[PDB]
Amino acid sequence: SVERIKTTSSIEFARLQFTY
Amino acid sequence: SVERIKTTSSIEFARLQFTY
């Protein structure tokens, strides 16, 4: 089966992850 | 008297508050 990945417009969660 | 609450499109101030 085939699907589409939905991407959030906000990367700041991952940047907060990196900083923390 | 009634009014409408205006919400900012950016939540990262509160997330920075939490992390800090």
UniProtKB/Swiss-Prot annotation, chains A, B:
Subunit relationships: Homotrimer; disulfide-linked. Binds to heparan sulfate proteoglycans. Interacts with gH/gL heterodimer.
Name of the protein this chain belongs to: Envelope glycoprotein B
Full-sequence portion shown in this chain: 488 to 507 of 904
Localization (cell): Virion membrane; Host cell membrane; Host endosome membrane; Host Golgi apparatus membrane
Organism field: Human herpesvirus 2 (strain HG52)
Similarity comment: Belongs to the herpesviridae glycoprotein B family.
Its biological purpose: Envelope glycoprotein that forms spikes at the surface of virion envelope. Essential for the initial attachment to heparan sulfate moieties of the host cell surface proteoglycans. Involved in fusion of viral and cellular membranes leading to virus entry into the host cell. Following initial binding to its host receptors, membrane fusion is mediated by the fusion machinery composed at least of gB and the heterodimer gH/gL. May be involved in the fusion between the virion envelope and the outer nuclear membrane during virion egress.
